[PDB]
């Protein structure tokens, strides 16, 4: 009759002998008809949910989906795509049931009834994004994404609650070995999640530095790192502190911020031994010593290239094993773009150069090269909790920059045909028209006024030129043979014009729109930081210690390892591990 | 002993911004201008990784014969940090806004710049692009850098001042 | 009331004595201490929640004694606790 306060009465009183059976069907009804609110009645007043949670019981619990849902037929179909393959027709199935139907407050209520309340709301919140995308229709996507967030509102609120508890025993709420979705993790939970809400928080930002700086206590200072890369002995010290002196080594170069400053500092050397050949190693002989040492170096940069490539959730799941895929993936990180680029153009600016022909033409490739190769110092250094949050503001200002550049090209066009048409210089070449138009005017935005070329006033020597009217010598080298002079308070004019729309309208309304616009997205691409942070920790944790010149040491000992044949878990054993999910389970009930 | 003095008279003024931070017309803002180095630092990262790879793209490019170390680290940082602020060799990089032509047995085409560390001469094979390349530093340091300093300046000003 | 962090005993006990505004920064003075001696600090969260609140009641009855009497409320700070 889906009414409540008859059903309470009849179960607070008159006569209270209800024995097992008589709550049993009663939950059934209470389940296939949606109903939430006797479901917690029930569990109140207790189930027993290992006698209650049969199999037939479930298949029956399926059995009453919606037929023209996205599911029913997708059993049907079956009859994320790994969950088809396990679900199949003592409150993990049953808060598993309701995510998979939408039911929304039966999910949220069998979340308060079960283990594991962190790992689950991070766990509904996979199964809701990746199920809205294997969901036809968009309506209910709304309700699937909207109940998605309301996991993603509680998770975050229970951890933080056990995170000011204790930070050490909540640090080991993310990296336990979770035996469900084939040994997961908390972390690998929340990136498969697209969790930006779950990484924002305060307590999971403090854990990812503890694993940046792993078994090297993240509180040490930068300058004791960089005084302790740079003599390997000051390791063993009174500066930095950590948690057989042989895996004292290997808590130290295995660390990731150590294998960040190994590839920071391989990669400066790059960039230096990169210069040294293109500013003073660069004849048109055949490729000297550190000509060669440059190729070898970017073929490392290119195997380092490929081991992201053939080694790399919103998509696919881990392990497609089929390229098509994991080229995919690899081809749409805007940084692998970035480094493939360089290296496609290292590449054509060496086959350039060792042609005897295309000698001048593979320098120039290289020194765009060399543009190409410190830009990727922006990639590198976003891991960085100090710059990389502002290196990830600065291409939310280019859809600014396109309107300025649109603004100031549209006046830069109507101020330089009107001032090359106005002055009529002798020298009109399309190289130099093309100038006076463009390049001359955009210099006058910064300083290079040059008025000696475009204001007759200021330039002598007036018979210049055999054609009638009056004309005037310009003294620049581009600014033409002579220019006229019929107009030329007009220039004048039509410089000061300039100035004002392009150095001052245009510049100081930049301004204004990036004053505004850092103001959007400073909140936003904050929290799109912290969710690409523990990306970044993790990709260097499973990249080899050995930096990119020496890392064909780590190749030859990879490619050794297969001639003779970073998932991050810590490890505890299952009674220490049980205390932490009674010490968690506890902090849940104080929550609710 | 007299340059060390030099820049002792510099810390000893700097210790003047000390003093009148107990003024509450000037102090509520001398304690800001510390605030703000956080976003200097990135404004000098940012500018300095793009000075690396401006300057060394547009020494490359136009090749000096005048290549010392000194000279070459000023051609590549100084030179291009000035066109910040204006000072933008024009007749040193772009070989159209410079005469002799003929100044080096190397194979290739050469011209002399007049100024005194702008080499003795430069390439002028591809100065169609290092003007593009001056064009493009001028974009991103001094419209993109610049601008979204002040946006970070004005940002945290908002933050820190209460 | 102050030193087991008893904090509505505090809260209490501050409102029945003499010293309103000594006693709130004194107050303010010990938990701020007493927070660095202490060794975990799950505790010191309260500790240091109730230290604020004792910030606030000293902020508001000084601010009250102020716009009373500029002068009378003067000596209140440069009396001889
Ligand atoms: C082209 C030039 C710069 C050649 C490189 C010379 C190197 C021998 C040394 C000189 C000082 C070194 C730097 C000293 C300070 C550090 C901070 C360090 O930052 C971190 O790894 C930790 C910050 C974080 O937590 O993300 C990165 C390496 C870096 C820049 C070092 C990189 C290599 C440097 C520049
Ligand atoms: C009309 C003329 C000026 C030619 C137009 C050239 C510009 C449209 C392009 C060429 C080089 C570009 C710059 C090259 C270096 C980058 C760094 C980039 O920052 C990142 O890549 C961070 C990585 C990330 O956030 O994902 C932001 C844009 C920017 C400044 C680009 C701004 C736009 C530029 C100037
Ligand atoms: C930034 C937005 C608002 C648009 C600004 C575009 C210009 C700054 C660009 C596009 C066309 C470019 C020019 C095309 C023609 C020339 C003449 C050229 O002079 C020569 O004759 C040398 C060899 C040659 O290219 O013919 C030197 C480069 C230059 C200025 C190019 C560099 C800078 C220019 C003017
Ligand atoms: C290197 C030169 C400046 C030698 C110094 C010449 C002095 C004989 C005189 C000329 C005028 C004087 C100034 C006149 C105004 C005052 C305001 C005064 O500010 C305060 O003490 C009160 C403000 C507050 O409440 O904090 C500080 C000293 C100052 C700068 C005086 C400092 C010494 C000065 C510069
Ligand atoms: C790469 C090249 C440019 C060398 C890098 C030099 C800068 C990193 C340093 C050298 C001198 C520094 C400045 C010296 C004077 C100070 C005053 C200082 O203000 C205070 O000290 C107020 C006191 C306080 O608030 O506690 C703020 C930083 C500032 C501008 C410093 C800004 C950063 C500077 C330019
Ligand atoms: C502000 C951030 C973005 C980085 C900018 C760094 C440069 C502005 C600094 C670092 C290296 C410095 C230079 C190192 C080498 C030289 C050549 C030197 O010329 C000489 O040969 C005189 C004596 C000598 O030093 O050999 C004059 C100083 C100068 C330009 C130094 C002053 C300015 C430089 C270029
Ligand atoms: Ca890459």
Request: proline letters at 5%; one cysteine or more; glycine letters at 6%.
């Amino acid at each position: 009759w889906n009414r409540v306060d008859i059903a309470q009465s009849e179960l607070f009183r008159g006569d209270i002998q209800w024995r097992s059976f008589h709550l049993e069907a009663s939950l059934m009804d209470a389940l296939l008809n949606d109903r939430p609110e006797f479901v917690r009645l029930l569990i109140s007043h207790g189930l027993s949910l290992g006698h209650f949670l049969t199999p037939m019981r479930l298949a029956q619990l399926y059995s009453a989906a919606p037929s023209n849902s996205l599911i029913r037929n997708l059993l049907d179909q079956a009859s994320v795509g790994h969950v088809l393959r396990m679900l199949l027709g003592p409150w993990s199935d049953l808060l598993l049931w309701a995510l998979l139907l939408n039911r929304a407050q039966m999910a949220m209520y069998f979340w308060e009834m079960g283990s594991n309340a962190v790992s689950s709301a991070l766990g509904a919140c996979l199964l809701l994004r990746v199920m809205a995308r294997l969901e036809p229709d968009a309506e209910e996507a709304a309700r699937r994404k909207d109940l998605a967030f309301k996991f993603e509102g509680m998770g975050v609120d229970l951890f933080g609650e056990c995170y000011r508890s204790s930070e050490v025993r909540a640090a080991r709420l993310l990296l336990r070995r979770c035996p469900l979705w084939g040994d997961a993790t908390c972390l690998q939970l929340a990136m498969q999640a697209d969790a930006r809400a779950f990484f924002a928080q305060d307590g999971v930002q403090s854990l990812l530095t503890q694993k940046w700086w792993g078994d090297m206590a993240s509180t040490t200072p930068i300058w004791a790192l960089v005084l302790a890369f740079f003599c390997p002995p000051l390791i063993y010290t009174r500066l930095i502190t950590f948690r057989r002196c042989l895996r004292r080594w290997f808590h130290f170069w295995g660390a990731p911020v150590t294998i960040f400053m190994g590839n920071v500092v391989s990669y400066l050397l790059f960039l230096l031994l990169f210069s040294r050949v293109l500013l003073v190693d660069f004849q048109p002989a055949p490729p000297g010593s550190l000509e060669l040492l440059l190729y070898f170096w970017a073929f490392t940069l290119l195997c380092e290239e490929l081991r992201q490539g053939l080694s790399g959730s919103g998509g696919p799941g881990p392990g497609h094993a089929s390229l098509s895929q994991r080229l995919r993936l690899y081809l749409a990180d805007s940084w692998n773009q970035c480094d493939l680029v360089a290296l496609t153009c290292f590449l054509l600016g060496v086959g350039c150069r060792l042609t005897p022909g295309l000698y001048h033409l593979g320098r120039t490739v290289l020194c765009i090269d060399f543009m190409v190769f410190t830009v990727r110092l922006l990639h590198i250094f976003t891991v960085n909790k100090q710059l990389g949050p502002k290196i990830v503001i600065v291409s939310k200002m280019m859809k600014d920059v396109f309107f300025f550049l649109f603004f100031l090209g549209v006046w830069l066009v109507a101020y330089g045909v009107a001032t090359e048409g106005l002055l009529r210089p002798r020298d009109s070449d399309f190289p130099s028209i093309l100038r006076r138009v463009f390049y001359r005017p955009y210099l006058q935005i910064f300083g290079q006024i040059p008025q000696e070329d475009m204001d007759v006033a200021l330039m002598e020597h007036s018979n210049c030129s055999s054609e009638p009217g009056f004309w005037a010598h310009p003294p620049g080298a581009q600014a033409g043979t002579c220019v006229s002079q019929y107009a030329n308070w007009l220039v004048v004019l039509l410089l000061v014009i300039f100035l004002l729309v392009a150095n001052i309208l245009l510049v100081n309304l930049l301004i204004a729109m990036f004053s505004y616009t850092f103001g959007k997205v400073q909140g936003n691409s904050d929290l799109y930081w912290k969710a690409q942070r523990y990306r970044l920790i993790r990709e260097f944790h499973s990249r080899p210690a050995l930096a990119p010149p020496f890392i064909v040491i780590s190749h030859l000992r990879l490619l050794l390892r297969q001639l003779c044949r970073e998932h991050f878990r810590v490890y505890l054993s299952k009674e220490a591990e049980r205390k932490l999910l009674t010490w968690e389970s506890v902090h849940k009930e104080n929550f609710l």
